[PDB]
Coordinates of C-alpha atoms and ligand atoms in Angstrom, one line a residue:
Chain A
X1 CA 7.6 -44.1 19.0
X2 CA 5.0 -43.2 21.4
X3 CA 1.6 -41.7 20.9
X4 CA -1.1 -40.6 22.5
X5 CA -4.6 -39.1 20.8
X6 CA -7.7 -38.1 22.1
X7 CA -10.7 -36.8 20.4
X8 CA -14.1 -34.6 21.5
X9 CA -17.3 -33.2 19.5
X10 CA -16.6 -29.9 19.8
X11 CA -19.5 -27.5 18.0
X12 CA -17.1 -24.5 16.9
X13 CA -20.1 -22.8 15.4
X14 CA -21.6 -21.8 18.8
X15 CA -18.4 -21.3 20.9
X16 CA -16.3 -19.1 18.9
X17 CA -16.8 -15.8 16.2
X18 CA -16.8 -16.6 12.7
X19 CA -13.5 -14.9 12.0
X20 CA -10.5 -15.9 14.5
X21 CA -7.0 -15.9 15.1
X22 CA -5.2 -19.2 16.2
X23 CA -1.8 -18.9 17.9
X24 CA 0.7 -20.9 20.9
X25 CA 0.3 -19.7 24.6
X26 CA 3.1 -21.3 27.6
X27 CA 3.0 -20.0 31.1
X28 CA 4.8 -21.0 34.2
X29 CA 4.3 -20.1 38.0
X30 CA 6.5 -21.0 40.9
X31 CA 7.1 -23.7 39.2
X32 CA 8.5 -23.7 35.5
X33 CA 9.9 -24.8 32.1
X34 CA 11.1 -23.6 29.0
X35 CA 8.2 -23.6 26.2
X36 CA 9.6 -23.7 22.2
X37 CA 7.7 -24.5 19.4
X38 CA 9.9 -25.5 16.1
X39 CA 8.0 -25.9 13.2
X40 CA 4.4 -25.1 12.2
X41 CA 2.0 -25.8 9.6
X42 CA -1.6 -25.3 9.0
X43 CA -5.0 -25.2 6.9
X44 CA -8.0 -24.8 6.6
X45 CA -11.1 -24.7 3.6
X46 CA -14.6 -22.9 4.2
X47 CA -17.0 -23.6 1.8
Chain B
X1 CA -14.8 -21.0 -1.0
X2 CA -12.0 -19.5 0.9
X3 CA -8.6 -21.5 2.3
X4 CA -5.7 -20.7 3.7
X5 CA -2.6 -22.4 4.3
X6 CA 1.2 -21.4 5.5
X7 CA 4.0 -23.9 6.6
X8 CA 7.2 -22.4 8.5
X9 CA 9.8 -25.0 9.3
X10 CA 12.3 -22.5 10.7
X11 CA 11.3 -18.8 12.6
X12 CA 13.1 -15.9 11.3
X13 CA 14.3 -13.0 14.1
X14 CA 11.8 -11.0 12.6
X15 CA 8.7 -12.7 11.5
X16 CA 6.3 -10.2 10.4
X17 CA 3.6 -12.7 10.0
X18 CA 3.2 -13.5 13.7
X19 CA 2.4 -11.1 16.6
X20 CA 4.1 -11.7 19.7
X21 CA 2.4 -11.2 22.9
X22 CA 3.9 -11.7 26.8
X23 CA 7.5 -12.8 26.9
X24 CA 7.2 -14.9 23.5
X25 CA 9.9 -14.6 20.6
X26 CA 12.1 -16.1 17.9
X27 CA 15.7 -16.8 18.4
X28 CA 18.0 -19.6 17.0
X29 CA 15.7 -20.4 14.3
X30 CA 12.6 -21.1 16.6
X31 CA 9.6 -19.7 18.5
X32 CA 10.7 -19.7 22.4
X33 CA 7.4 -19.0 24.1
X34 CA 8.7 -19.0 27.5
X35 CA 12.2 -19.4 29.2
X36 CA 12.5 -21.6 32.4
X37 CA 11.7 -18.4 34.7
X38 CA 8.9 -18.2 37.2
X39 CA 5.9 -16.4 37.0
X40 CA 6.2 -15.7 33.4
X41 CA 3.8 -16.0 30.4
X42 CA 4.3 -15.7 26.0
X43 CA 1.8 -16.2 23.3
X44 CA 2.5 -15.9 19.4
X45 CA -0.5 -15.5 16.8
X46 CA -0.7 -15.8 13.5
X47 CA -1.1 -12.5 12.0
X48 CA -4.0 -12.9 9.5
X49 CA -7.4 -13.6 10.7
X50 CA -8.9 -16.9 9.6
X51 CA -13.0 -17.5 8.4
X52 CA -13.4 -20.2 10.5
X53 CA -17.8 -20.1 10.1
X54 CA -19.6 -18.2 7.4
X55 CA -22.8 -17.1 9.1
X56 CA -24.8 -17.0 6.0
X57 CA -24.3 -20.4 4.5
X58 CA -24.1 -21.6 8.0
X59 CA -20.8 -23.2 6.5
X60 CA -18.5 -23.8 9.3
X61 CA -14.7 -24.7 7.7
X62 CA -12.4 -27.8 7.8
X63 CA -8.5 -27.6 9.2
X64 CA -5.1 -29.1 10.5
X65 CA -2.6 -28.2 12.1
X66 CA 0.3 -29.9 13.1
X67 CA 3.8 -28.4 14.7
X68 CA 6.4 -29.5 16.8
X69 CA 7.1 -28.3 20.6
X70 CA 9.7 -28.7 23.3
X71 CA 9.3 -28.8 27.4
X72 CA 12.8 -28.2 28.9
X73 CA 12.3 -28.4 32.2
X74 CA 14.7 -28.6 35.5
X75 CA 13.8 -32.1 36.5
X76 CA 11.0 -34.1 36.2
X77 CA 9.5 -32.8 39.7
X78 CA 9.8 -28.9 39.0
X79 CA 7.7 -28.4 36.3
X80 CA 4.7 -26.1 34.8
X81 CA 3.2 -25.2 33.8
X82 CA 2.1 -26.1 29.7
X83 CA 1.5 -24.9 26.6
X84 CA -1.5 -24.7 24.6
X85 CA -2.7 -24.4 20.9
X86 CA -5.8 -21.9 20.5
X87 CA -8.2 -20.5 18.7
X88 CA -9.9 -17.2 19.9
X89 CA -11.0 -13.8 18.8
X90 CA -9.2 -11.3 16.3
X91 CA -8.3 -9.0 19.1
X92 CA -7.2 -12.1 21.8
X93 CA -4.9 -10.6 24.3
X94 CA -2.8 -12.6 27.2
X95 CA -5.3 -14.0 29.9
X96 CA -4.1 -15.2 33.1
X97 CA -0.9 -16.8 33.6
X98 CA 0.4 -19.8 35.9
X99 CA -2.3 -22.9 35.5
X100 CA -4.6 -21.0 33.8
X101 CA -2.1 -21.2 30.8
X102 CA -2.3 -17.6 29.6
X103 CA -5.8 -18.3 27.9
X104 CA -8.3 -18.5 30.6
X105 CA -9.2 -16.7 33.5
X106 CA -11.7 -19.0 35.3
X107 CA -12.7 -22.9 35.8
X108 CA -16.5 -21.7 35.7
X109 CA -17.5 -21.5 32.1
X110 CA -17.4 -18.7 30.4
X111 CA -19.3 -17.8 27.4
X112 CA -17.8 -14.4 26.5
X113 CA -14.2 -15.9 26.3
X114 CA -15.1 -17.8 23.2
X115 CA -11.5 -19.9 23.0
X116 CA -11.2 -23.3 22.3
X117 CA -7.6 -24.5 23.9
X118 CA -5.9 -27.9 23.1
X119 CA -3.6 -28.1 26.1
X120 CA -0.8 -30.2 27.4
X121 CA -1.0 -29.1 31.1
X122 CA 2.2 -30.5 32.9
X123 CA 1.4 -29.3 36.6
X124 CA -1.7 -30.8 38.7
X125 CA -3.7 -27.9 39.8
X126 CA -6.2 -29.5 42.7
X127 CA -8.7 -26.3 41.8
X128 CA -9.8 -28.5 38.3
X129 CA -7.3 -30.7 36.9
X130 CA -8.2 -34.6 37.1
X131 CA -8.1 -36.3 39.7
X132 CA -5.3 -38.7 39.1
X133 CA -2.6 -35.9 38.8
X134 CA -0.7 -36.9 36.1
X135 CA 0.2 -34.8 33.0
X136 CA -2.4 -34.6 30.2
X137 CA -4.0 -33.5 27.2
X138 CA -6.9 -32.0 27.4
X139 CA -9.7 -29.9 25.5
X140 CA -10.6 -26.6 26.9
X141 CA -14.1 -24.6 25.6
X142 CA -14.2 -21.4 27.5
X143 CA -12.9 -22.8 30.7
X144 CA -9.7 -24.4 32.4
X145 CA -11.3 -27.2 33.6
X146 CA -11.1 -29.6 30.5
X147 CA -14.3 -31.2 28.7
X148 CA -11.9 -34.7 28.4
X149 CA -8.7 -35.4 28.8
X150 CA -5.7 -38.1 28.4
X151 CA -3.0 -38.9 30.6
X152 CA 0.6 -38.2 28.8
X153 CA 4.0 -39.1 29.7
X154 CA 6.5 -36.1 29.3
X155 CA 9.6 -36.7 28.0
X156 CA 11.7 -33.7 29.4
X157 CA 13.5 -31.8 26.7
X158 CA 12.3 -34.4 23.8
X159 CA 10.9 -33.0 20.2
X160 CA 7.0 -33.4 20.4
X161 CA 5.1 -34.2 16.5
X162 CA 1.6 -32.7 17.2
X163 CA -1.3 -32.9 14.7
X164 CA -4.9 -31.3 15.5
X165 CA -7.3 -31.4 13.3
X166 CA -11.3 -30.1 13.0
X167 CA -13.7 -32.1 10.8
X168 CA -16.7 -30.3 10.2
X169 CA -19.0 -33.0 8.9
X170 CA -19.0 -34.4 12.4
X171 CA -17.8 -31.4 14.8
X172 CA -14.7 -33.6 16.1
X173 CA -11.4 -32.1 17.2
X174 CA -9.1 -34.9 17.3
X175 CA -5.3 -34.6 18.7
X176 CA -3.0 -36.6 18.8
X177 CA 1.3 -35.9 20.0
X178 CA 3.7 -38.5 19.0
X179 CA 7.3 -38.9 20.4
X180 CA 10.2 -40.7 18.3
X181 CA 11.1 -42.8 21.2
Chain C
X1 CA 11.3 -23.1 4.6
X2 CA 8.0 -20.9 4.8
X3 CA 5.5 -21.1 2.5
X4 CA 1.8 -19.3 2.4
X5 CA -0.9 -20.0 0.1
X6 CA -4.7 -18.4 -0.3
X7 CA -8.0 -18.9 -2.5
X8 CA -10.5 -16.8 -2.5
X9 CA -13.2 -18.1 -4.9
X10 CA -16.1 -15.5 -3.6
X11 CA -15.7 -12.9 -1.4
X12 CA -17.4 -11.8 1.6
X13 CA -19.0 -8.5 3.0
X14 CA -16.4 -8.8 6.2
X15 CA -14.0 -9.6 4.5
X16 CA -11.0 -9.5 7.5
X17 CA -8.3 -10.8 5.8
X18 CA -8.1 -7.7 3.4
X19 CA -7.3 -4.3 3.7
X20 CA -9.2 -1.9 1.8
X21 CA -7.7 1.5 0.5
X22 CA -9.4 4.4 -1.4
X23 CA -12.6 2.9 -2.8
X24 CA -12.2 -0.8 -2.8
X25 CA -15.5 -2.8 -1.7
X26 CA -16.6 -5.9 -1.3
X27 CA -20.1 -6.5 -2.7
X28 CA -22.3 -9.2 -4.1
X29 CA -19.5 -12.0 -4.3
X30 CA -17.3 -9.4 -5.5
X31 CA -14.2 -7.1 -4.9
X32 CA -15.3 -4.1 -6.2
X33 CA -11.8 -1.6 -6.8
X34 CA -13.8 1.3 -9.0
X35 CA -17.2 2.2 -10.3
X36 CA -17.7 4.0 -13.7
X37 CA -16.7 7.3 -12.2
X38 CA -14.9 9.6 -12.7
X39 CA -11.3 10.4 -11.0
X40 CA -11.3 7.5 -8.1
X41 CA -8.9 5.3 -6.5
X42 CA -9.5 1.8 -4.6
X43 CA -7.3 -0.5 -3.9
X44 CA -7.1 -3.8 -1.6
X45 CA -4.4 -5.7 0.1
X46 CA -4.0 -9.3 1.6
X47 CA -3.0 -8.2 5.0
X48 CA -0.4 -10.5 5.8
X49 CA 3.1 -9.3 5.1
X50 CA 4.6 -11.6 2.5
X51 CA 8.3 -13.1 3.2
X52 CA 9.5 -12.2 -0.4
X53 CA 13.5 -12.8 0.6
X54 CA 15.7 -13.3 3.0
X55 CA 18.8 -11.0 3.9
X56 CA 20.4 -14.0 5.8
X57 CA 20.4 -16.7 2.8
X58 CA 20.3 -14.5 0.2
X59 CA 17.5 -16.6 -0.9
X60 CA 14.7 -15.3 -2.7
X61 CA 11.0 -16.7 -3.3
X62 CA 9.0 -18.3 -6.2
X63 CA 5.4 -17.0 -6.2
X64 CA 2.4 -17.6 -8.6
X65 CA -0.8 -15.3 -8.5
X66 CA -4.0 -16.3 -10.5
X67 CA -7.1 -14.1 -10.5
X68 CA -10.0 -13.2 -12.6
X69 CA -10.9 -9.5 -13.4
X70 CA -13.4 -7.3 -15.4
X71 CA -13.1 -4.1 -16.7
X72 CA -16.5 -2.5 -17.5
X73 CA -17.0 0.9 -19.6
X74 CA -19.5 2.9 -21.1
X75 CA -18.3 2.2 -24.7
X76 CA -14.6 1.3 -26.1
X77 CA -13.9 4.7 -26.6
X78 CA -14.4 5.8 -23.0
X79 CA -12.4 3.9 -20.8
X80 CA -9.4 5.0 -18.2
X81 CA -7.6 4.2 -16.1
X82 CA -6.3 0.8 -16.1
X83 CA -5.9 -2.1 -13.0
X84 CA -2.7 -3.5 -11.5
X85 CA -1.6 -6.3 -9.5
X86 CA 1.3 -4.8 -7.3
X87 CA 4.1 -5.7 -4.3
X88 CA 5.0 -3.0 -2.5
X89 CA 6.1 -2.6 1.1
X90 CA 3.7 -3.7 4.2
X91 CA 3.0 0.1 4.7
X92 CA 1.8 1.2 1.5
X93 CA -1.0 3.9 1.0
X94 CA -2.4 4.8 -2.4
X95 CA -0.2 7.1 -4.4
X96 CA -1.2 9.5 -7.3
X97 CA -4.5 8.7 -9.4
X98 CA -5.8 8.8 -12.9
X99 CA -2.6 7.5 -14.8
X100 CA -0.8 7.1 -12.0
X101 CA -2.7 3.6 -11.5
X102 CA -2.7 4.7 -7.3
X103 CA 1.1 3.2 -7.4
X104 CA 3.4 6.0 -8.7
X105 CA 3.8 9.2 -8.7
X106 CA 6.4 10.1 -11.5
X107 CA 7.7 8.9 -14.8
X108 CA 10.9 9.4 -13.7
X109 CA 12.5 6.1 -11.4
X110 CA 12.2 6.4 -8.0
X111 CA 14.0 3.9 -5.6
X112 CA 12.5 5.1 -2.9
X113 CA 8.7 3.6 -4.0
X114 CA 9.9 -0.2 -3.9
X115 CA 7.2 -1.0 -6.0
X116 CA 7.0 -4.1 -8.7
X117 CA 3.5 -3.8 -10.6
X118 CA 1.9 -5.4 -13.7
X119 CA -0.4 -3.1 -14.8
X120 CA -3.5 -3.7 -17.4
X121 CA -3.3 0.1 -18.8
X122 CA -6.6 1.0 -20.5
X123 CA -5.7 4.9 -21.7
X124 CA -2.8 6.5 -23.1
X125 CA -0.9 9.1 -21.6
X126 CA 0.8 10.6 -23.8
X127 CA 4.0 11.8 -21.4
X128 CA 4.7 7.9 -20.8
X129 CA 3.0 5.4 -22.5
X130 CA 3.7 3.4 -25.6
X131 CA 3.8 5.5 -28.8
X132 CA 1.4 3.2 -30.8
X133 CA -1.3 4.4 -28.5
X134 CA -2.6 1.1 -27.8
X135 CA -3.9 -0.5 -24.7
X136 CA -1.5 -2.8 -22.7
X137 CA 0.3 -5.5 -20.4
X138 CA 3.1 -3.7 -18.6
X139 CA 5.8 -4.3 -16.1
X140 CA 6.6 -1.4 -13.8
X141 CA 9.0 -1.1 -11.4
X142 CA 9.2 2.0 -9.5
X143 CA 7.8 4.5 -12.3
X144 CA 4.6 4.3 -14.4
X145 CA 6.5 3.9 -17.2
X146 CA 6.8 0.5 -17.6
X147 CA 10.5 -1.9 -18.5
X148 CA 8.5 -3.5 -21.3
X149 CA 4.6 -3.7 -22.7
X150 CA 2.7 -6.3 -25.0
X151 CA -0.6 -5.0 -26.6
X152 CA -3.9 -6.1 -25.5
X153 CA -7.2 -6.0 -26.9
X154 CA -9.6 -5.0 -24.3
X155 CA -12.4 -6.9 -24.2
X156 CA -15.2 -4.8 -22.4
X157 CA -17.1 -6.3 -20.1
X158 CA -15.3 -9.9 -20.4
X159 CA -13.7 -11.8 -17.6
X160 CA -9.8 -12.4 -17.7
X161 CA -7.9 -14.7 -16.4
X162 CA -4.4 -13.9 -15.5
X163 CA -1.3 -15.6 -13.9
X164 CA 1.4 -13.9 -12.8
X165 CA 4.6 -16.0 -11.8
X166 CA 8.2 -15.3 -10.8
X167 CA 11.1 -17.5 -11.2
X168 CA 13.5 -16.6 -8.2
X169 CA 16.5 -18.8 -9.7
X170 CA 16.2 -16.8 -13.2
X171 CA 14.4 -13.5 -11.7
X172 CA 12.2 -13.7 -14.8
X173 CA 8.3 -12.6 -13.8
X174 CA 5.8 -13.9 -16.3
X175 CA 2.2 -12.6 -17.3
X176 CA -0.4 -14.2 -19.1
X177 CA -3.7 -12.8 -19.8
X178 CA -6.9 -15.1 -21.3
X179 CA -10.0 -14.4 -22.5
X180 CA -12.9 -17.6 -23.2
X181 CA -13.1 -15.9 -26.5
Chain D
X1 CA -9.5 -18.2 -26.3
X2 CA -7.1 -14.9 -26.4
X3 CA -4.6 -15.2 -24.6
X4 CA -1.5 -12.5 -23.8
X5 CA 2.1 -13.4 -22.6
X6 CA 4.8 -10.9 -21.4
X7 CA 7.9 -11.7 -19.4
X8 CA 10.9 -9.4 -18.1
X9 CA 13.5 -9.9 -15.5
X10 CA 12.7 -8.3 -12.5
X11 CA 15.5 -8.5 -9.7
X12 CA 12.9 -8.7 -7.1
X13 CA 15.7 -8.2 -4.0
X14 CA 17.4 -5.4 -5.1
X15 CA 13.4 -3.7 -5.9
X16 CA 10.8 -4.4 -2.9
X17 CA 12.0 -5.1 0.7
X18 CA 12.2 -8.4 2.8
X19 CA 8.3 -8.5 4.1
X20 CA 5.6 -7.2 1.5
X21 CA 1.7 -6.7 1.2
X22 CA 0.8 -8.1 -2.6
X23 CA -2.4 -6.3 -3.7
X24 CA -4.9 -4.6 -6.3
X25 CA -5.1 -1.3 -7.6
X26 CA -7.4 0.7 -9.9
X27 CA -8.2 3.7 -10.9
X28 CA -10.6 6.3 -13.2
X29 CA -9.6 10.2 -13.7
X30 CA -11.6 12.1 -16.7
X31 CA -12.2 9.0 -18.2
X32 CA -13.9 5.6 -16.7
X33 CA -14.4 1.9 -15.8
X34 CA -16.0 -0.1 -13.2
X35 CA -13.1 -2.2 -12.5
X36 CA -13.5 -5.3 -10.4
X37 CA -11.7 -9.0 -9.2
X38 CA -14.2 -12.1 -9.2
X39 CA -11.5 -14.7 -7.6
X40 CA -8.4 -14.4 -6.2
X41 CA -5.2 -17.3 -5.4
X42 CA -1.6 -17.0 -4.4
X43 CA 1.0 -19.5 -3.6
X44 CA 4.6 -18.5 -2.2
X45 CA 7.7 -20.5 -1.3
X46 CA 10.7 -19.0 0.3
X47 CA 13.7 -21.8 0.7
Ligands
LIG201 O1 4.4 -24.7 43.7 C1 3.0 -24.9 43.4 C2 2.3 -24.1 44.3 O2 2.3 -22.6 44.1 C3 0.9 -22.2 43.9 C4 0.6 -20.8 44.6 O3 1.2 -20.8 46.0 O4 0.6 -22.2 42.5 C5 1.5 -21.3 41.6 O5 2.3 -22.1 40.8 C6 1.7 -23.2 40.0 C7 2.7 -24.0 39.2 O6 3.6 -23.2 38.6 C8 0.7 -22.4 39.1 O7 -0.2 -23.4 38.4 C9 -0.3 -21.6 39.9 O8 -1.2 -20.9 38.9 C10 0.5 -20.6 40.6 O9 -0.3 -19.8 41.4 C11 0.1 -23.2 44.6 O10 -1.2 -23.3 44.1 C12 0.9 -24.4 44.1 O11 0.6 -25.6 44.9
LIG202 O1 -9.8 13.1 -21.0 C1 -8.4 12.6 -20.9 C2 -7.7 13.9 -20.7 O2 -7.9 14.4 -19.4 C3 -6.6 14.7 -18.8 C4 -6.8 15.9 -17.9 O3 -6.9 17.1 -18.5 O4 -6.2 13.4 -18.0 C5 -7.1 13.0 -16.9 O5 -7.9 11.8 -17.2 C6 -7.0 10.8 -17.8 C7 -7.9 9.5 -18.1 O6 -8.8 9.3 -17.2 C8 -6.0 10.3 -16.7 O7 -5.0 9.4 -17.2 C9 -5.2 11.5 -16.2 O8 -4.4 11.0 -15.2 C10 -6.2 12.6 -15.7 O9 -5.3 13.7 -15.3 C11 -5.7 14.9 -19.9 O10 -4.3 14.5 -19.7 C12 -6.3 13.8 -20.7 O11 -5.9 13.9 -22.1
CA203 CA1 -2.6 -27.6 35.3
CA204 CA1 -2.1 4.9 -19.1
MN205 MN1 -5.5 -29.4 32.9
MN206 MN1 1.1 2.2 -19.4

């Protein structure tokens, strides 16, 4: 198994509007790949 | 308090709870994002919009997110050019393609896109990617060019475990992509 | 497998993740469907579509709903016309008022409305309601006149809590309303 | 404590369609209420 992590401070607050949508984005160029996602799960508590 | 939560281990043909934006869409049980075509870009949201700040407690909220991906690509040499996980505003359309992933339109930063990209950027764009030109994971705030990154090995058509997650006692985003082998 | 799940302990002015119909506001901490006046209609809606069953399994889903309510009158001998908690298809639009709930339009079953509801009915309408003349608990499903009722004592001004659940592998939907006192 | 119980079988997949909205409704006509929700949770599971 191989992993790699990485971590940043990041202060959402300031950067982005207090309601958001979050979602997947692949491009290619002249060069390219296939992009699939299979699975998906997420959460999130305010307050 | 207000939470939200949704776990989909297998994409119907018609999943009302996403919106589908470029080329992206479900087939075969899972969420194809782009086929391995030039010039081409997809994007899938989540349909409901999430209270990520509250501005009058001045709360900001707590999350993870993990999923699983895929890069099929021709060979090891032809490839690009990556796939991001973001987080932008309600009304988010498709930026530019190519390097700049579909999410960005600029390496200068800019504070009216107000997206936060994690991105796993398989193709060395000389313009702002680092110097050593291998593939990496990198942060994006408002720009292409990266606020850190990590070098990553691909492993070309092998399942990818992601898990991001956002603490908001500290502010840290961490990431982290784990392969089987 | 997709599962989505929500809590909303205190709602906000801007609140995105709802969509309001007729009257409904959110105000003071509070989803707000009717004031004490007369002949009105408000309804709200989580926005994202719910994946209630599949055509391709067959399979359908379990659900539990838990939510706390007040109904507030002038005295206990004025009070109409009742509250529901409803599923009904993404598209839906408020339907006839007073009686009517804002989910039906007839007494008479109507495929075509698609509409499951467990309604809290405060006043009795005569064409439909139960003969006793008390207020009640009822199942609907595409009529106002409801499969079956259980008698409630309205408690004006109280706060009730109520879970709603559904069984998918026995189809039975359960209701239970508390009061403190 | 008061507490209420009703149950019927609903056969929810020959009712309401594949995708739904789940919601609240209220209403007043000659006669009237303030009717209003204080807290609000749901939990689905399909497969
Ligand atoms: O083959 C790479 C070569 O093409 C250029 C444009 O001539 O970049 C295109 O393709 C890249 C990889 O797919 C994209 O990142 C880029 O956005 C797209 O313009 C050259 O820049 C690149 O060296
Ligand atoms: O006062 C109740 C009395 O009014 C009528 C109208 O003539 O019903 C109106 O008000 C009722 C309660 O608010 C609603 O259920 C009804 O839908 C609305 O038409 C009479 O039917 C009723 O007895
Ligand atoms: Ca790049
Ligand atoms: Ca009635
Ligand atoms: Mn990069
Ligand atoms: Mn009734």
């Amino acid at each position: 198994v191989t992993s790699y992590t990485l971590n940043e401070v990041v202060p959402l607050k300031d950067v982005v509007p207090e309601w958001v949508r979050i979602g997947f984005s692949a491009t290619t160029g002249a060069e390219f790949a296939a992009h699939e996602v299979h699975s998906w799960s997420f959460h999130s508590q305010l307050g | 308090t207000e939470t939200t939560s949704f776990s989909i281990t297998k994409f119907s043909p018609d999943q009302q709870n996403l919106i589908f934006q470029g080329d992206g869409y479900t087939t075969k049980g899972k969420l194809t994002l782009t086929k391995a075509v030039k010039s081409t870009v997809g994007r899938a949201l989540y349909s409901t919009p999430i209270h990520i700040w509250d501005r009058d407690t001045g709360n900001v909220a707590n999350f993870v997110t993990s999923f699983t991906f895929v890069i099929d690509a021709p060979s090891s040499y032809n490839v690009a050019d990556g796939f991001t996980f973001f987080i932008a505003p309600v009304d988010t359309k498709p930026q530019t393609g190519g390097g700049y992933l579909g999410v960005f339109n600029s390496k200068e930063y800019d504070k009216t896109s107000q997206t936060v990209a994690v991105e796993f950027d398989t193709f060395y764009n000389a313009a702002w990617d680092p110097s050593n030109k291998e593939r990496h994971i990198g942060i994006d705030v408002n720009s292409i060019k990266s606020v850190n990154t990590k070098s990553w090995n691909l492993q070309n058509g092998e399942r990818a475990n992601v898990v991001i997650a956002f603490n908001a006692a500290t502010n840290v985003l961490t990431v982290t992509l784990t392969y089987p082998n």
